Amino acid sequence: NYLYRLFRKSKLKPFERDISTEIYQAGNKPCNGVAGPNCYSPLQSYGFR
Amino acid sequence: GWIFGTTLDSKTQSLLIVNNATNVVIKVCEFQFCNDPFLDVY
């Protein structure tokens, strides 16, 4: 239930809320919702074992 | 009306600072579904 961003664009200033995200394009591959190569979601859950 | 934003998109972030001749100086959190809330005094 707790999400953190693995990677992003250029870094933040103090005190941003950036809850809106869709996808990152790591190449010329047009995934746009596919978990295949050169495309991944930024949000990924901790697990907290 | 002073609609702000970073891309002016439904998915991303936006603001809808509005003003009038009355106490409706409301600064809403995130309104994006309205394309143009113009003068609607009817």
From Swiss-Prot, chain B:
Annotated consequence of substituting residue 19 to Q: Partial loss of biliverdin affinity
Glycosylation-annotated residues: 20
Subunit structure: Binds to host ACE2. RBD also interacts with the N-linked glycan on 'Asn-90' of ACE2. Cleavage of S generates a polybasic C-terminal sequence on S1 that binds to host Neuropilin-1 (NRP1) and Neuropilin-2 (NRP2) receptors. Interacts with host integrin alpha-5/beta-1 (ITGA5:ITGB1) and with ACE2 in complex with integrin alpha-5/beta-1 (ITGA5:ITGB1). May interact via cytoplasmic c-terminus with M protein. May interact (via N-terminus) with host bilirubin and biliverdin, thereby preventing antibody binding to the SARS-CoV-2 spike NTD via an allosteric mechanism.
Protein task: Attaches the virion to the cell membrane by interacting with host receptor, initiating the infection. The major receptor is host ACE2. When S2/S2' has been cleaved, binding to the receptor triggers direct fusion at the cell membrane. When S2/S2' has not been cleaved, binding to the receptor results in internalization of the virus by endocytosis using host TFRC and GRM2 and leading to fusion of the virion membrane with the host endosomal membrane. Alternatively, may use NRP1/NRP2 and integrin as entry receptors.
Name of protein: Spike protein S1
Organism of derivation: Severe acute respiratory syndrome coronavirus 2 (2019-nCoV)
Gene name of this polypeptide: S
Portion of the full sequence shown: 103 to 145 of 1273
